[PDB]
Ligand binder design. Structure first.
Ligand SMILES: CC(C)(COP(=O)(O)OP(=O)(O)OC[C@H]1O[C@@H](n2cnc3c(N)ncnc32)[C@H](O)[C@@H]1OP(=O)(O)O)[C@@H](O)C(=O)NCCC(=O)NCCS
Length: 186
């Protein structure tokens, strides 16, 4: 898992930490502005590792993008003992987006669903249930059911994940790089 030049455990007391555009350090020695920079470094590095895994020319997640857009990230820290300064396992980034979405009749619909915009679990610990734990937490906090989500450019791994954990299989064909499932328009 990803290690940093600072104490991750002190920075993030909870196993899953929710952050928005304000990048607020969880409550409660280092100055607030310095804690905020630590958070920014974490988000930047997570964004980079995700991008490299998805073969992207540039990250779609970074600290600066987070603030200027108004997206929300959920960050899962490592529960095992790695030195002793803690570590980060992965994250999921969500946000509402206005989209034109095709239905089963091939008509375009104006909608604004919650979208899964980025999602990454460290390669070394994938397939150990971390992705499900993070996803479940996000669902409970965001108050949405899985079939109401739009998924941005999902990988084959993520499609298999959604079918396994949430029985999401049947898609409604789109032209815009988002994926939606049957029941989205329900
Ligand atoms: C997608 C991802 C977040 C899944 O998280 P995870 O912690 O591996 O997921 P979990 O352990 O909770 O769930 C495991 C299930 O996910 C799916 N999955 C995970 N890794 C997989 C792989 N290498 N091949 C096929 N399916 C996979 C499978 O359905 C798997 O179930 P199985 O092991 O019974 O086949 C993680 O694989 C990842 O970071 N992938 C790279 C980034 C990415 O693809 N993001 C999606 C585009 S935004």
């Amino acid at each position: 898992s990803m290690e940093f030049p600072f104490d991750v455990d002190a920075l993030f007391p909870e196993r899953i930490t929710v952050l928005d555009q304000h990048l607020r350090p969880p409550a409660r020695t280092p100055a607030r502005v310095d804690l905020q920079q630590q958070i920014m470094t974490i988000i930047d590095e997570l964004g980079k590792a995700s991008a490299k895994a998805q073969n992207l020319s540039a990250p779609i997640t970074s600290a600066s993008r987070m603030q200027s857009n108004r997206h929300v990230v959920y960050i899962l820290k490592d529960s095992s003992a790695r030195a002793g300064k803690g570590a980060i396992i992965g994250f999921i980034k969500v946000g509402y987006k206005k989209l034109f979405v095709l239905d089963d009749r091939e008509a375009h619909n104006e909608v604004e669903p919650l979208c899964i915009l980025d999602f990454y679990i460290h390669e070394s610990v994938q397939r150990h249930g971390h992705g499900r734990e993070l996803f479940q937490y996000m669902l409970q906090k965001e108050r949405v059911e899985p079939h109401q989500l739009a998924i941005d450019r999902p990988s084959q791994k993520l499609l298999k994940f959604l079918n396994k954990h949430y029985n999401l299989e049947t898609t409604v064909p789109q032209v815009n790089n988002f994926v939606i499932f049957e029941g989205f328009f329900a």
